[PDB]
Amino acid sequence: KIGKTLWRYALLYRKLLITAVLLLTVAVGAELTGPFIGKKMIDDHILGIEKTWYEAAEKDKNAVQFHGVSYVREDRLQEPVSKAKEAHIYQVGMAFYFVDQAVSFDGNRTVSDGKLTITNGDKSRAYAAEKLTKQELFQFYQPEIKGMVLLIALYGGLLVFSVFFQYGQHYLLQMSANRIIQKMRQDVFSHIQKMPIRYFDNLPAGKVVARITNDTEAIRDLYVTVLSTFVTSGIYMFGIFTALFLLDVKLAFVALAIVPIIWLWSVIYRRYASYYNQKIRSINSDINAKMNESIQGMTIIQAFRHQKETMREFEELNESHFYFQNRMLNLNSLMSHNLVNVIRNLAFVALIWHFGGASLNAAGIVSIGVLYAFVDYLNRLFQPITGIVNQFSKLELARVSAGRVFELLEEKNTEEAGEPAKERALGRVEFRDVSFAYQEGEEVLKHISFTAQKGETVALVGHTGSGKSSILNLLFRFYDAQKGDVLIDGKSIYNMSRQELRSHMGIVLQDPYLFSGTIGSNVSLDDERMTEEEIKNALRQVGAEPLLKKLPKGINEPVIEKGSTLSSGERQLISFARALAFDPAILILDQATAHIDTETEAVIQKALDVVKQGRTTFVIAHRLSTIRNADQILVLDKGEIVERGNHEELMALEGQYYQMYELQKG
């Protein structure tokens, strides 16, 4: 499935891939024609002197005047003199020997009394021969000079030509990869906005960030590897193999016999490297964890004199890690490049065997040009092996990361709904013996039935683990009640879009979140839909906070550090300011501050008083002192509303409020 999805995302942007492939093909074609130019230069011009020569006239018709007689090569012949006048130029040792006579056999050569004997092991016809000094040879080589120049030009021309296409393709491919990843990223984030709240509750916030970003990076590396290395190497090897077959078919098959070598090498190297690398990484993770847990909280390590044992464990880890590093080194020292050099020298030996075998046969021709072409092609062919094997071993991590991202994408149980609200809530809200269970067969709220009037400050006060926060979750539809029913102004909550509902309400939580950025954007949550109504902070208070430095309507940015520098009281203050700025109809206060301080909570009380006005407020708190004025308190036990009424009515029977108010003081 991973391969299918990767191919599907690659199919997008297929124009870039097609263009890059074509450019790469042209570049490789030119780079590999170069050696044909070199081979022709060598053979057809240097070794063409050994080809026959025929005497002719002297009108510079491709002829060279040896002493007083002009000759022309057979290739540059117009049949003026072909059969009677046949000349040759052999070379024995370092000397070049001109024979002015026709010949029949060809084999080993020696000169004893000027009679160049060509034995060949069958019979030796001795022909008188001369030496050509050092300048006469030049005169037989002079004409070819022009041809070579042209050939040279071609090389250079093609060379610079080829250059441009490489830069063309490597770029495009990269872009392709990057672009695909970008698309992928967007998709995942979109899906994140459609998952239920459960998904986030039952999984740490750290892992989802990793899944969104680091796994996308791993897939990007996978794409870069695949394209740039594998496709390029495949095309390059196919081109080299085409060239070799065009040159000589016999050695082409021998050179084709190397592919199983690469196959087996890659298989074995992967088989061992995967295991050793896995052990190394696990041990390094353990070492880092041990070092961290020791560096933190070392006071008891020193107090109880545990230094020796911790050092013992650390050295055990160190010994194992060092051992596996050495094993990986052994594997490398037996495959990484030594095997390449062995194969390279073995190829040299094979070339020598093949060509020297033909030479001794006395029938085949050495054709040094083909030798040059093959050495060049094999040097280019043996280059990409180490990469190929390394990334082949490494592919597995990326394959697992891609699997993870795709199983994330393919989730089915998602939320699909969205629209702005079209009417003002009016704050009527009712409950109908709702009963919600978080996971299963364990009920946290049972038969919760109540009604809240337009009068605000309807607090829910109970005990720890009594099922108060679940009311907030059911009210914002973060979770479905699974039983009963909830009504907003006579309209069912479960018959309308979630965003529309959340548009009617507001929330303040225990930990006010301070998004990185400026205050103005933070107060408006970078909505951009609202004008300078952030001045609503004033309604809370001023406290000279804008006067301390710059302004908080997009002019001050003290939140870049998560708001740690700002006081916690100021954090809740900006939370209330945002809640009022959005100006909802129903306000829910989830406050569980562990210390009033009796100094920093006056501002919170004032903000609650100023914001609760003209709304329907639910105050989720257990202080029972700021909620003295509530129009209606509600106390529930183990998920059931045991008692309900006003503070005065609930003080008609002393009970729970009595115990709290009495034992809490001092």
């Binding site: 370092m94 770029y171 979109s190 916030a205 970003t213 070392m298 040094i368």
Partner: protein, 558 residues
């Protein structure tokens, strides 16, 4: 190139292995210099008249022999060098961890955990890479390029050599410049990706608010924009990254065609031969590498020097905060006294203690009360030798703590910090932690006398509010300290468990000193000596009875 000068100890300790490695490297280079020449000679001899099966067999044999020799020698010198690098990593890890163990809290206040973990995870890799691979590349770039150059010069020709090596220097220079600039752009792109990764955490941790205010579309827009920024950075990197293969191909093709063309020109003038031409081609083919080797060497050397000059600081320059001296002859602590102790934390100009004076007898229980931040726990720090002695005198029966061995002093005391420091081992190891795993039986007692074996019965042994505190106090009691110190040990449980706990500890520890720091004053009732600490001084001191006959001091609960 000073890293090798700063690592003299390692090479002096491991000199034989590196000597073998370098000798094998030189021998391998020389022996590997032949095969191109052998092929050149074989080609040059095929053309000539004389060539027999003997030459064929000889060439095959010599090629195989040279191949085997290079294979084995390469294996062995790589073994030696990379094993040396691994040993360097091992040694450095041991040194760093030991030094970290032997330090005191003040050192950890100046140095953040991130830097130490970096120096234990990054600098070591760089230094090991310097000792192994930088030396490998030095050997190559210095000798390999010289031997190939002087083999081509003397065996083949000098005009051809000088003419065909012109492009390689500029190729290397261009590679170096590209490497520097691409590293800069890569750092920029990595910074952009980090900036992206910061935003996703905020938009995923604060999911409730975003959905509550239907702001997910704005979060989508912001994420898409930052992804576009990351893409632009990546393309700016790829702009420079796509310049490696063109330059290398162009400037190697130039050298190869100069070789071929000008060598054919010389073959016409008869100074060269065909065999020499192919040998020259192969020599260039193997000469391509030192160009890259030079840049690799420079980069690794600079990185290694940067890492090492930094590791030596937090591994050597720091001196232990507290130092023992000639051990004194004392076996057990008689009485603990404070003679006008004055002390200030290193990282603050506030006193936190102003000539505190009191005394403690054997079996004496001392109670300390006060408000938060009034130097309640600073006094105990003045006794655990976690900071410089400062000023004053704290004599154990008549001798200042300075003479008591640090090993001996830790043996007497039993610390229970207010914070929860429980190591991620099994519960059994956490409690044996104090005893250093001497025996198993008294663990069940230790927990029973802690009256918290009930909690153990209500949890499966392994892994791992008040559970941490009970485990910590049990661990402290394992060692049977002669001076037991509790620093708000029982805060989660109040007036129901802690009372019986302290009663049982007091009755069990009868002739042993005990210190109780606690915010609640109900739990220090039986303490025959109680002190109230306000600011840097002690406002009042006396028995619990006297307390009742003094200013009402946070007794406004019962």
């Amino acid at each position: 190139f000073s890293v090798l000068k700063k690592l003299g100890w390692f090479f002096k300790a491991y000199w034989l292995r590196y000597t073998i490695a370098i000798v094998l490297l030189l021998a391998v280079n020389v022996i590997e210099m032949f095969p191109p020449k052998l092929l050149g000679n074989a080609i040059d001899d095929m053309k000539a008249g004389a060539f027999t099966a003997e030459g064929l067999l000889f060439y095959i044999g010599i090629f195989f022999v040279l191949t085997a020799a290079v294979y084995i020698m390469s294996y062995f010198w790589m073994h030696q060098l990379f094993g040396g690098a691994n040993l360097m990593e091992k040694i450095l890890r041991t040194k760093l961890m030991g030094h970290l163990l032997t330090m005191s809290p003040p050192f950890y206040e100046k140095n953040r955990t991130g830097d130490l973990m970096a120096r234990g995870t990054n600098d070591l890799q760089a230094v090991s890479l310097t000792t192994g691979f930088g030396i490998l590349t030095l050997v190559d770039s210095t000798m390999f390029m010289m031997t190939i150059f002087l083999t081509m010069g003397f065996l083949i020709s000098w005009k051809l050599t000088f003419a065909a090596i012109i492009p390689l220097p500029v190729m290397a220079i261009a590679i170096s410049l590209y490497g520097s600039k691409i590293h800069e752009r890569f750092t920029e792109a990595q910074n952009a990706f980090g900036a992206l990764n910061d935003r996703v955490l905020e938009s995923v941790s604060g999911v409730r608010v975003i959905r509550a205010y239907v702001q997910e579309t704005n979060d989508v827009r912001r994420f898409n924009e930052m992804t576009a920024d990351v893409y632009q950075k990546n393309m700016k990197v790829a702009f420079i990254d796509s310049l490696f293969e063109p330059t290398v191909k162009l400037l190697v093709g130039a050298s190869y065609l100069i070789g071929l063309g000008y060598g054919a020109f010389l073959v016409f003038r008869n100074e060269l031969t065909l065999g020499e031409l192919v040998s020259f081609n192969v020599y260039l083919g193997m000469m391509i590498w030192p160009m890259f080797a030079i840049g690799e060497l420079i980069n690794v050397m600079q990185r290694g020097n940067a890492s090492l000059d930094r590791v030596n600081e937090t591994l050597s320059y720091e001196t232990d905060v507290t130092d023992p001296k000639q051990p004194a002859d004392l076996k057990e602590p008689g009485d603990i006294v404070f003679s006008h102790v004055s002390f200030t934390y290193p990282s603050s100009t506030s006193d936190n203690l102003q000539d505190i004076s009191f005394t403690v007898r054997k079996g004496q229980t001392v109670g300390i009360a006060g408000k938060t931040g009034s130097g309640k726990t600073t006094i105990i720090k003045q006794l655990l030798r976690q900071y410089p002695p400062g000023e004053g005198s704290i004599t154990f029966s008549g001798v200042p703590i300075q003479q008591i061995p640090l090993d001996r002093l830790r043996g007497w005391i039993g610390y229970v910090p207010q914070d929860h420091l429980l190591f991620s081992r099994t519960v059994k190891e956490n409690i044996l932690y104090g005893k250093q795993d001497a025996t198993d039986k008294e663990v069940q007692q230790a927990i029973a006398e802690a009256h918290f074996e009930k909690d153990l019965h209500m949890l499966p042994s392994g892994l791992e509010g008040g559970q941490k505190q009970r485990i910590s106090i049990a661990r402290a009691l394992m060692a049977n300290p002669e001076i037991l110190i509790l620093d708000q040990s029982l805060s989660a449980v109040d007036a129901k468990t802690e009372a019986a706990i302290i009663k049982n500890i007091r009755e069990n520890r009868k002739g042993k000193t005990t210190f109780i720091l606690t915010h609640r004053l109900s739990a220090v009732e039986h303490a025959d000596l109680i002190l109230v600490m306000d600011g840097g001084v002690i406002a009042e001191r006396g028995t619990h009875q006297e307390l009742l006959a003094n200013n009402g001091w946070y007794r406004e609960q019962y």
